[PDB]
Structures are given as structure tokens and as C-alpha cells.
Design an enzyme around this catalytic site. Structure first.
Site, PDB file in Angstrom:
ATOM      1  N   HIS A  29       0.841  -1.167   0.000  1.00  0.00           N
ATOM      2  CA  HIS A  29       0.000   0.000   0.000  1.00  0.00           C
ATOM      3  C   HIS A  29       0.896   1.244   0.000  1.00  0.00           C
ATOM      4  O   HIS A  29       2.011   1.242   0.589  1.00  0.00           O
ATOM      5  CB  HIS A  29      -0.871  -0.041   1.269  1.00  0.00           C
ATOM      6  CG  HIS A  29      -1.962   0.984   1.326  1.00  0.00           C
ATOM      7  ND1 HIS A  29      -1.717   2.325   1.507  1.00  0.00           N
ATOM      8  CD2 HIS A  29      -3.310   0.850   1.312  1.00  0.00           C
ATOM      9  CE1 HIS A  29      -2.865   2.978   1.600  1.00  0.00           C
ATOM     10  NE2 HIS A  29      -3.850   2.107   1.482  1.00  0.00           N
ATOM     11  N   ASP A  55       2.842  -3.876   8.396  1.00  0.00           N
ATOM     12  CA  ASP A  55       1.694  -3.067   8.137  1.00  0.00           C
ATOM     13  C   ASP A  55       0.536  -3.997   8.310  1.00  0.00           C
ATOM     14  O   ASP A  55       0.232  -4.792   7.448  1.00  0.00           O
ATOM     15  CB  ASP A  55       1.739  -2.457   6.724  1.00  0.00           C
ATOM     16  CG  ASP A  55       0.459  -1.769   6.347  1.00  0.00           C
ATOM     17  OD1 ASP A  55      -0.521  -1.808   7.150  1.00  0.00           O
ATOM     18  OD2 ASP A  55       0.415  -1.222   5.218  1.00  0.00           O
ATOM     19  N   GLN A 104      -4.819  -4.325   7.343  1.00  0.00           N
ATOM     20  CA  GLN A 104      -5.772  -5.219   6.704  1.00  0.00           C
ATOM     21  C   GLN A 104      -5.867  -6.557   7.460  1.00  0.00           C
ATOM     22  O   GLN A 104      -6.896  -7.184   7.451  1.00  0.00           O
ATOM     23  CB  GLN A 104      -5.328  -5.398   5.256  1.00  0.00           C
ATOM     24  CG  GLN A 104      -6.421  -5.644   4.236  1.00  0.00           C
ATOM     25  CD  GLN A 104      -7.574  -4.649   4.268  1.00  0.00           C
ATOM     26  OE1 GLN A 104      -8.702  -5.067   4.407  1.00  0.00           O
ATOM     27  NE2 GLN A 104      -7.299  -3.360   4.116  1.00  0.00           N
ATOM     28  N   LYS A 153     -10.694   0.567  10.401  1.00  0.00           N
ATOM     29  CA  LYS A 153     -10.840  -0.736   9.702  1.00  0.00           C
ATOM     30  C   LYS A 153     -11.314  -1.920  10.583  1.00  0.00           C
ATOM     31  O   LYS A 153     -11.605  -3.016  10.086  1.00  0.00           O
ATOM     32  CB  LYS A 153      -9.548  -1.067   8.999  1.00  0.00           C
ATOM     33  CG  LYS A 153      -9.529  -0.457   7.627  1.00  0.00           C
ATOM     34  CD  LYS A 153      -8.139  -0.149   7.172  1.00  0.00           C
ATOM     35  CE  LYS A 153      -8.175   0.337   5.738  1.00  0.00           C
ATOM     36  NZ  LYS A 153      -6.812   0.321   5.138  1.00  0.00           N
ATOM     37  N   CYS A 184      -4.730   2.347  -3.787  1.00  0.00           N
ATOM     38  CA  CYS A 184      -3.531   2.863  -3.130  1.00  0.00           C
ATOM     39  C   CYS A 184      -2.353   1.874  -3.267  1.00  0.00           C
ATOM     40  O   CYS A 184      -1.528   1.734  -2.371  1.00  0.00           O
ATOM     41  CB  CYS A 184      -3.875   3.382  -1.687  1.00  0.00           C
ATOM     42  SG  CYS A 184      -4.969   4.813  -1.622  1.00  0.00           S
TER      43      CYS A 184
HETATM   44  C1  LIG Z   1      -5.882   1.116   4.799  1.00  0.00           C
HETATM   45  C2  LIG Z   1      -4.512   0.605   4.704  1.00  0.00           C
HETATM   46  C3  LIG Z   1      -3.375   1.473   5.006  1.00  0.00           C
HETATM   47  C4  LIG Z   1      -3.601   2.907   5.422  1.00  0.00           C
HETATM   48  O1  LIG Z   1      -4.615   3.107   6.405  1.00  0.00           O
HETATM   49  P1  LIG Z   1      -4.978   4.611   6.860  1.00  0.00           P
HETATM   50  O2  LIG Z   1      -5.936   4.466   7.991  1.00  0.00           O
HETATM   51  O3  LIG Z   1      -5.492   5.287   5.599  1.00  0.00           O
HETATM   52  O4  LIG Z   1      -3.677   5.174   7.378  1.00  0.00           O
HETATM   53  C5  LIG Z   1      -2.090   0.937   4.907  1.00  0.00           C
HETATM   54  N1  LIG Z   1      -1.885  -0.353   4.560  1.00  0.00           N
HETATM   55  C6  LIG Z   1      -2.848  -1.226   4.243  1.00  0.00           C
HETATM   56  C7  LIG Z   1      -2.463  -2.613   3.844  1.00  0.00           C
HETATM   57  C8  LIG Z   1      -4.252  -0.787   4.291  1.00  0.00           C
HETATM   58  O5  LIG Z   1      -5.290  -1.614   4.007  1.00  0.00           O
END
Ligand SMILES: *Cc1c(COP(=O)(O)O)cnc(C)c1O
Ligand SMILES: *Cc1c(COP(=O)(O)O)cnc(C)c1O
Ligand SMILES: [Zn+2]
Ligand SMILES: [Zn+2]
Lengths: 422, 133, 421, 136
Positions: C129, C206, C209, C232, C372
Site C-alpha cells: 500500500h 503493516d 488489513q 478498519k 492505493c
Molecule cells: C488502509 C490501509 C493502510 C492505510 O490506512 P490509513 O488508515 O489510511 O492510514 C495501509 N496499509 C494497508 C495494507 C491498508 O489496508
């Protein structure tokens, strides 16, 4: 009959009714909330629209075509517009952030990374600055090589016209000037026009965190280059702040944070950026916070912002007067029309923690006790003190939903602490 | 309520204020309790704590707790001072602790019902802890 | 119904916690399949935030009055709840504004602390992302560290072999920063394999998700940092989490400076507060933290294990039904590592048109575009057998979703294939 | 069939091929920004002084952005750069919900309803905002 020249009893009563916390009691005594300079209480009708948004019109924004994404993006962009109209700015000049603190950090880094604030340049701030508008400059001076100089304050923490003109003489051409719009300790509303015309070539940044909540700010007529504030000090939600910058300056800036939304083209090796203001909002923003900040602005406007300003003026004067009548209290800041919102003070013989504790437990009165995120200003106040100065202070501060009766209870409490409490 | 006769007395006590010139250990306490200042000064001889002095502005809860901490560790050893502070700490965080080690540090027990005054009580001890590596 | 995890009655109580689902679009019920961007909110969690805002609110840490105390206790208890959720110590949990900020924090602070220097490499993956890609790439220009990529195959998959072969060329990356799960391909990544292959790197996950639907034990996974976003996982916007090992956090220069994170301040020098406060500059999203805590309590009271299984079951169903479509191209692994979401294209129909009709005519919400991850789009392009639109549609499931929701999606896509024939 | 946004005019102009391609040796070439979520237009002009002779384009796009592009081209063939940048402003004005001139636009008016979709306006404008930047 509630002693306002600004609001009638009915309309005032309707306003207090919006703030459910005012119905709490602490040990039998109604909440007298005088800690508004740290944060404000929340309005029920504004919070209910925020919850309406979360539950019925919520989704992430800008990058989808479905019904809820559409509704939320519209709501969010209208919140940007309400904030723009509130400061007399253009909406492409308005950037949502997490708060004042972030906004300032945004500006130190980005100004340095953009080559506007170069090595050996001078940033001028005041001695009365909050840590948010001090610690970033001081600490990062050591990573980017600029210098930090100070407009000095007097013994009571006042920033005089003479100190400003005197500093012009020693430091005539600071690349950046970062100044509070109103001190969160001394209550002093700073003379921003005088500062702007005195340092006409500086990038001028104003920390508006205490100022924007009770006084009209027109960014065009002040001609400030940048202005920051926090939603939570103006009835708003937490997690949300604003950074106004002039369009021409914002166009020249390296973004502070990187990620989604703020890019145009991304490759494995290169990135280019989106247009204003999206270039400066990396990732999902506090969507519901911005929308809530918009409804908060609407609420204040439905009251009349000029009325809020005059009501706080009238409370400010009264608080100052009653605090000044007490022989056992030392007060800090100017005794003049520039003093608003808040009074910092000490009770002779009694540590602020104990003062603030006793005011809460025995009188339901909320006040801050300590440094008020301004350690260096404590040393300036210590040199002007005529008591055993504890390197801290009590702070009572007023806002929209306060009354003269609130202030009389503060006065009762302080006389009680003076009389008893060995 | 929080302000018992015991606490007010120990807040006023003047026996331990001061610097020790050329002290073995000078430990400035951290701003973990707003403008409650404690800088502790120690003399030792091995593990015994012969003297301890302290300087700083502070609220009655902080000054009392410092004076009491100091009384209970003077002439006592470094190693036991650190278990005494673990028990003073446990008393506040609602944990198991038992009175034995604390003696009259137990009179500060009610301070735990005031979550924002806990810092005021703990500052001296937290600074004793850093000072005794 | 049609769940191996929730009884009809239990599931039905869950759906009714989300008022958004009662909305209709041109006569049809909302089918929300854009969970990978953000999730709908639960009434009980929001009512608890309302109560907080209206009756228990003040600023935190620095005052002794009643509301300041209740709010400070509330906030610190929320930290503890997040700690328990990840099996971390509470001093290792930093509240942030989001995953994005958390990653920017790391790049800047690892560079300012001297850990990530001119002669050092950060290894990331091609499927990242923008939030775990753009900061590394852009800030390489300012700090001079190198950026290297673990490569994806034609379908966007990071294979074990790819991970091992990268280890041959890039033996000692100073930092490895990888997604726990891709927001385009759905691939849950082999974190344990990554951690052991790069045992000497500082490992960042990260988790934005991953964390919403699979239990993460940061001690057992042995990651050095993890980030995710509250919005999320049914939580408020404007709130995120960074987890870091205590011993590493202690060595890091703060990213942001201001109130609360300091210890001593003079005009010339500054020292820092203790963990975790050292990494929280200024007034945080207080209400957001507290609501994220109530969100986690809500999830734990359903049973996070049931959430994970229900999501597994829906994903398998989603994947099965989409694979039966002759007119669609699916991206990602299409095996047991594939979770939460499916990216795809309809042959001869642009993603915007697919999502618009899905929404306007079927009440189905989906994303359409780069998601993204623009550089991943070029990788998927090279493996496309159709005329690839440099974008995809993406459907993504979560707790309040059902098999009937996926069926409405399938029907929609059949209607759409006929519309542009 | 029955439809909402995808009107008979939009569907017809979305399928048009007439303007698909590049011009070899072009007096102007402007790539659109990606402010439209992966709709792409690259415009190729031949000029002949201050007028506009021939236009062509490439890029994967949307039914709406493709239609908008085809119609845009077909109405700026044989017109001055300013006899085109003023359509552009009206085109934009229509879309943002402001007053505009019906006659300047000609059959572009058939995109009126698209103003009612906040998230599809970008798809309509893409070629126009690209034509703006291409001529300054
Ligand atoms: C949504 C997402 C992000 C960024 O999340 P924000 O709340 O917009 O900072 C980064 N990495 C992954 C894999 C995502 O799904
Ligand atoms: C409260 C305050 C700040 C800090 O704002 P946050 O919302 O805590 O980032 C900065 N400056 C002044 C003058 C303040 O009063
Ligand atoms: Zn204290
Ligand atoms: Zn489009």
C-alpha cells in the site's frame, strides 16, 4: 438575572442546556468547569449529528463511487468549506491535521525540507510559547541547523510592544516568526498586526489554539502566512486540527507526511503529488472529526460568534476583577484589555495541586495545576514572584457556557483554601 | 478526606530539606507529576544509607511521601529500600503488597482513591528507584 | 443464514447493531463490500463514545479535577485493552492518527536515530500500500538509504521462493517493512517465514488489513513494530496504533514534539518523558482511543475466533463464486492464503462503471481504481489476459456480511456483463 | 434498456472509435493527471496556427470519461484555442453546479445529469481539465 449584557436569560439557559456535563455534581456540588484552556465541554446536538454521520452516512472518502463514499466525501468537503469561511480563507488553503501540535511539527519539518528554512537561518518565537510551539523548533534546530531566538517577556510574563521592537533591532530579518495568538498561561492576546508589519519579510506562523475559540480571526486581514488550531478547544471533537496556509506558500511546500490520497503518480522509484489541499492529507483523515468540527462551527454561528466573543470578554473581565480583589493571590499576565479567557495564579502558602484538588473535591470547580505545557515561561514568572514560587500555577479559564456565578464559586473556594488548610 | 493529620504533619516537616555538599549520589526526579520537584541527595558507606536530603517544591502529598520515605530508609540498606518501594508502588496500583515492609507508609493508602494524586505520592519512590540503579 | 459459525439468531443480533445496513439504494438494501477501505460502525460502541464526550470528557494526564481523572483513567484503560488485544505490554502501545502516520513515524525516527543511514537498505514488497511504500521511497532522497523490493509474480502473489531468493541478493537489510495482508490481492503474508529469513533486520508489519480479522500475537510473531488503523476494525476515525518492542522504542528519537512527550524543557534543551508518553505529542484522539477500546471489547464479546472464522468462510465463498465466472479476471493467490477480499476486472468493462452500476442498481458498495497500490497495478498488467485498465474493482467482506451479500454481487456482475455487451 | 446515469447519448459516444489513436509528429501532447482513480487520457493535437485541426487520444477509461472525451474532441475540431477554453469553462461550470452558457456547449449539455453524481464528475472533467493544461 444571570448578569449578562450579551445574552437574555432564556437564550443563555438554552445554551447551558446543550451541555449535559453541566448537570454533573461532584460530592453534592454542581460542576463548575473552568479548565477550558485545556479542553472544552461538548454540545449534545453537535455530538448527535456526529453520531448520525458515523451510523448512517459513513465511509472512506475520495476514492470510490458508491452511495456512502459519495455522501461522506461531500460531507467532509463541506466541513472544509465551513472552516474556510470561518477564517476568511479559501478551502484549498485549509488542511485537516490531528491537532495544533501536529500542524506546528508539519511546518518545522516541511519548511526545512522545502529549503525555505535553511541552515543558519533564524526562527523567532516568544518566551511565553506553549511546548507545541517551542519544543519542535528547539529540538529540530539540531537536525536542520537553523537557530532559535526569543522575543523576551517581562516579570509577569507580558510581551510588550517595546520587547518586540527591541528584538527587531537585534534580529532584523528572521526567516520564520512563530508566535502565539494568545498565551495559554498569561491570557495575553498578542498584537499580531504589529508583529506582521515589524517582520514584514518573515514567514509568520500563528499558534491560534487559544485564540480561535473565542475571537474572530480573518487570515487575510491579519496577513499571517500560517495559522494552526485544535478542534477540541472550540467545542469540537478530539483528534482534529486545522492548518491554514497561504496558497502561494502551500504550493511551494514538501509534504510532511506521505501515503495514500496525497499522491498523483506513484512508481517503485518515484512519486509525484496531488493538488491542494489533498497533497497535505496523507492517508485516511479523521473524517468524522472534520465533519463534527464543521457542525461545531455551525453551532457557534447559530449563536452568533460576536456574542461568544463578547460573552467571554465579559467573563474574562469579571474573573480578572474578582481575582485581583484577593490579597493572598498572586496573578500573572497583563492587567489590561489584552488579557482574556484565563487567569493563572498562585495561592499564598499552598501548592497548586492542593489548590486544584480542594476546588474540585469541596467545590466542584475544575482548574489546571502545573506548568501548563510552558516550563520555560515558569522561570520567567519565578523571577517576578513575591511569594515562595512553586514553579507552577493554578489556571482558571472561561468559555461560552460559563457564568459569573461559576466565577463566584471559584472565589468562595479559594477563600476557603486560604482560611483552612495548614 | 485525603488530607489527614498524619499527611499534613509530614508535609510541613523540615528535618530533611537541603543539599548534601559532595553527596555520593545526586538524583534529580523527573517531571512525572507536574511541578512536584524532588532532587534526592544520598550518603552511603557500602549498602547502609547514612543520610538522605531532598530539595524541591511540591504539594502536601508529595512532600509528606518524600519525608516519610526518607525517614523509613535512613540507616536502612539499599537492597531493602528497593523492596520497600516495590511495596509502596504495589499499594497504589491496587496489587498485593502487605503492610510489614511499609510500616507507616500505609497511612498514604487512601491516596489510591484519587487517581490523579497517585503521581504525587509515587514521585519520591520512583526517584529513589532510579537513584538505586 | 448459511453460516457454520453463528446461529441465525446470534448473527441477526450482530447485523442489527449496524444501522447503516437498514439503508436502501433505489429500493435495494445496502450490500457493503468495501470493508477493506473502512468499516461500518456499531451502535453500542458509538453510544458509549457519546456518553464519554458528553459526561466524562476533559483533557488528560495533567490535572487533578474529576473529569480530567475519569478521562485519563478511561484513556489509559483503552491502551491496556489494545495491549491485551496484541499481547503486548501497555508501554509498548503508542496511539497515533492511523497506520499511515505510524509508518511515517517509523521512517523519520529510524533515520533521525541513526538506525537507517545512508549505507543501509530498507526491504519492502511490490504489493505494498502507498502508506508502506511512498514514505520509504520519498524519504530515501532526504536521508540516502536504499529501497529494495521483494518481487511479486504475474498475479500479485509473494511466494515463499521469492522471499528466499531476495534473501540471496539482499542478505542484511537494516529494515524490513512488509504488509501482514495485501489490500489488493488478499494475500496473508508468511510473517513467520519473513521473521526467520531476516532474523537480523528490524521488522515492521503493516497490519491494517490483517488485524481486523485475524488475532495477532506480537510476541509470538516477534515483530519489531506493527501498525494498524481503528477505522478498519469497526472503530472511530482518526485513531491508529503503533506497537514497538520496548527495547527499540527506548532507543528512538521521537517523531513529533510538543506537550506531554517532554520531561524537562528549557529554552535551549529538552529531555523526554517515559514510554509510551514520549511518543504521543500533544492532545491525542482521546475519544478515539476510548472508542477503539470499546470496539475491541465488542469484538472480544462476539469472540474474535468466530470473527476470524466467519471472515474465512465468507472469503472462501466469495472466492468460489467469483472463480465460477467466465467473464472475470481474478488477481491474487486463489488459495488458502487468500483472505478478506477479491480484486478483479470484468472483461471489457472499466472498474468505475462496474462499481457505479453495482452501487446504483444493486446497492452493492465496492472500490474501483488503484486501491492505493499503483505499482502493483503494473505487475498485474504484465500478467493480464484481457485488456487491462490499470485498475481493478475490489470486493471485501467483514463481520456483518453474509453469503446472500456475495450472491447479490454475483448477480450484479452478470447484469453488468450484459449491459455493455 | 432503462438506466440511470448511462443515458443513450452517453452509451453511444462511449463506443466511438473515430478519435482513438496518436498523431505522429504532434504540435502538442498532454498526459492527464490521475485525479480520476485510473481513468487515463493522453491528448494529441495538430494545430495550424491559432485554430485546432485534429485531435486524438489514448488511455483506458470509463464509459463516462470516454464519452466526455469523444464529445469534447468532436466540438473543439475546427475552433480557436480560446473558442475551446471557454467551452471548457462552461463544461466545468455545468459540472460544478454554476451558471453556464447552453449554446456554447451544444450537445455537451447531454452530460447535465452527471452533475448529480459527485464521484463521477472527475470522470467527465478529466479530458477537459487536461485540454485546459494542454493550452497554456
Ligand atoms: C488502509 C490501509 C493502510 C492505510 O490506512 P490509513 O488508515 O489510511 O492510514 C495501509 N496499509 C494497508 C495494507 C491498508 O489496508
Ligand atoms: C492546547 C494548546 C496547544 C496544543 O494543542 P493540541 O490540541 O494539544 O495539539 C498549542 N498551543 C496552545 C497555545 C494551546 O493552548
Ligand atoms: Zn502533586
Ligand atoms: Zn471514471
Amino acid at each position: 438575572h444571570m448578569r449578562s449584557t450579551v445574552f437574555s436569560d432564556e437564550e443563555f439557559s438554552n445554551i447551558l442546556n446543550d451541555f449535559p456535563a453541566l448537570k454533573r455534581n461532584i460530592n453534592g456540588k454542581r460542576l463548575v468547569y473552568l479548565d477550558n484552556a485545556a479542553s472544552t465541554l461538548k454540545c449534545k446536538s453537535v455530538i448527535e449529528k456526529m453520531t448520525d454521520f458515523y451510523l448512517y452516512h459513513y465511509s472512506n472518502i475520495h476514492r470510490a463511487v458508491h452511495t456512502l463514499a459519495s455522501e461522506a466525501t461531500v460531507a467532509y468537503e463541506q466541513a472544509r468549506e465551513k472552516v474556510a469561511n470561518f477564517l476568511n480563507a479559501s478551502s484549498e488553503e485549509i488542511i485537516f491535521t490531528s491537532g495544533t501540535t501536529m500542524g506546528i511539527n508539519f511546518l518545522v519539518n516541511s519548511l526545512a525540507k522545502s529549503g525555505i528554512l535553511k541552515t543558519e537561518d533564524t526562527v523567532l518565537i516568544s518566551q511565553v510559547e506553549h511546548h507545541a510551539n517551542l519544543v519542535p523548533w528547539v529540538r529540530l534546530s539540531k537536525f536542520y541547523g537553523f537557530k532559535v531566538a526569543y522575543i523576551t517577556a517581562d516579570e509577569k510574563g507580558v510581551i510588550t510592544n517595546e520587547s518586540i521592537l527591541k528584538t527587531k533591532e537585534s534580529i532584523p530579518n528572521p526567516k520564520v516568526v512563530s508566535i502565539t495568538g494568545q498565551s495559554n498561561v498569561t491570557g495575553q492576546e498578542m498584537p499580531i498586526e504589529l508583529i506582521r508589519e515589524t517582520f514584514k519579510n518573515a514567514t509568520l506562523i500563528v499558534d491560534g489554539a487559544q485564540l480561535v475559540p473565542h475571537k474572530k480571526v480573518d487570515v487575510k486581514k491579519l496577513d499571517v502566512d500560517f495559522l494552526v488550531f485544535s478542534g477540541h478547544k472550540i467545542l469540537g471533537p478530539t483528534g482534529i486540527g486545522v492548518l491554514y496556509g497561504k496558497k502561494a506558500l502551500l504550493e511551494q511546500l514538501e509534504p510532511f507526511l506521505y501515503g495514500g490520497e496525497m499522491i498523483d503518480k506513484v512508481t517503485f522509484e518515484d512519486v509525484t503529488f496531488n493538488v491542494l489541499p489533498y497533497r497535505f492529507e496523507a492517508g485516511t483523515q479523521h473524517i468524522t472529526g472534520a465533519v463534527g468540527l464543521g457542525y461545531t462551527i455551525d453551532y457557534l454561528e447559530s449563536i452568533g460568534f460576536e456574542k461568544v466573543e463578547k460573552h467571554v470578554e465579559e467573563l474574562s473581565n469579571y474573573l480578572l476583577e474578582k481575582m485581583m480583589e484577593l490579597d493572598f493571590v498572586e496573578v500573572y499576565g497583563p492587567i489590561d484589555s489584552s488579557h482574556k479567557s484565563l487567569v493563572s495564579f498562585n495561592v499564598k502558602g499552598v501548592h497548586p495541586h492542593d489548590v486544584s484538588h480542594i476546588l474540585d473535591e469541596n467545590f466542584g470547580v475544575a482548574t489546571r495545576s502545573g506548568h501548563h505545557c510552558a516550563q520555560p515561561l515558569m522561570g520567567v514568572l519565578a523571577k517576578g514572584s513575591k511569594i515562595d514560587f512553586p514553579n507552577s500555577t493554578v489556571r482558571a479559564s472561561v468559555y461560552l457556557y460559563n457564568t459569573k456565578e461559576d466565577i463566584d464559586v471559584l472565589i468562595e473556594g479559594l477563600k476557603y483554601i486560604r482560611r483552612w488548610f495548614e | 478526606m485525603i488530607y489527614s493529620e498524619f499527611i499534613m504533619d509530614y508535609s510541613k516537616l523540615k528535618k530533611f530539606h537541603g543539599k548534601i555538599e559532595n553527596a555520593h549520589k545526586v538524583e534529580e526526579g523527573k517531571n512525572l507529576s507536574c511541578g512536584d520537584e524532588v532532587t534526592l541527595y544520598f550518603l552511603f558507606d557500602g549498602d547502609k544509607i547514612v543520610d538522605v536530603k531532598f530539595e524541591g517544591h511540591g504539594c502536601a502529598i508529595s512532600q509528606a511521601s518524600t519525608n516519610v520515605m526518607i525517614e523509613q530508609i535512613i540507616g536502612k540498606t539499599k537492597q531493602e529500600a528497593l523492596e520497600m518501594m516495590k511495596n509502596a508502588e504495589n499499594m497504589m496500583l491496587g496489587k498485593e503488597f502487605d503492610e510489614n515492609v511499609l510500616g507507616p507508609i500505609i497511612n498514604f493508602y487512601d491516596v489510591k482513591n484519587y487517581p490523579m494524586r497517585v503521581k504525587c505520592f509515587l514521585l519520591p519512590w520512583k526517584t529513589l528507584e532510579i537513584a538505586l540503579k
